Design a protein around this ligand. Structure first.
Ligand code: HEM
Ligand SMILES: CC1=CC=C(C(C)C)CC1
Length: 137
């Protein structure tokens, strides 16, 4: 289930984080507008760039904490506020988070592995709901 999936992803997080974020950026290429250091790069090139691996690993470090602290895939209101209020998320709307979770569920469904992709799809929706109620546009 979801709790075990948090453990699996944490067991190889740097790699999962890169592969999932790359799936997100390739699936929705316009989402690179938020990450202009990443334009005109292959996946292998991005995996060589220090802030791509650093920032992506910190994104998924926090995403796993939020997941871990959820009840029935519903994140804490304090976690949604933190995500809204972050200055690096000034630009952002719930559409950006929706697309990130579409890509994460698709990755999970295409993997050889017994991830609970239904739980992750609900977590994504529930997180977008929470981000809306915390005041993200
Ligand atoms: C649950 C989902 C997400 C979590 C947990 C999260 C978390 C974080 C964290 C921890 C950082 C700081 C990274 C660092 O500087 O070391 C960060 C930065 C940032 N995040 Fe998010 N984030 C999420 C979703 C998104 C989405 C969907 C977007 C845009 C589509 C986004 C855009 C950014 C940007 C632009 C930065 C700063 C520039 C950069 O790090 O490249 N985030 N995020
Ligand atoms: C904060 C942040 C999120 C995502 C990335 C890519 C490299 C995954 C870097 C910046």
């Amino acid at each position: 289930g979801f709790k075990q999936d948090i453990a699996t992803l944490r067991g190889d997080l740097r790699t999962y984080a890169q592969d999932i974020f790359l799936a997100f950026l390739n699936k929705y290429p316009d989402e690179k507008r938020n990450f202009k250091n990443y334009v005109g790069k292959s996946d292998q090139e991005l995996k060589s760039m220090a802030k791509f691996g650093d920032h992506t690993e910190k994104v998924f470090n926090l995403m796993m904490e939020v997941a871990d602290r959820a009840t029935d895939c519903v994140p804490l209101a304090s976690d949604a506020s933190t995500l809204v209020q972050m200055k690096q998320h000034s630009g952002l709307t719930t559409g950006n988070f929706e697309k990130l979770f579409v890509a994460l569920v698709e990755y999970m469904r295409a993997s050889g592995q017994s991830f609970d992709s239904q739980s992750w799809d609900r977590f994504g929706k529930n997180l977008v709901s929470a981000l809306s109620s915390a005041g993200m546009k």
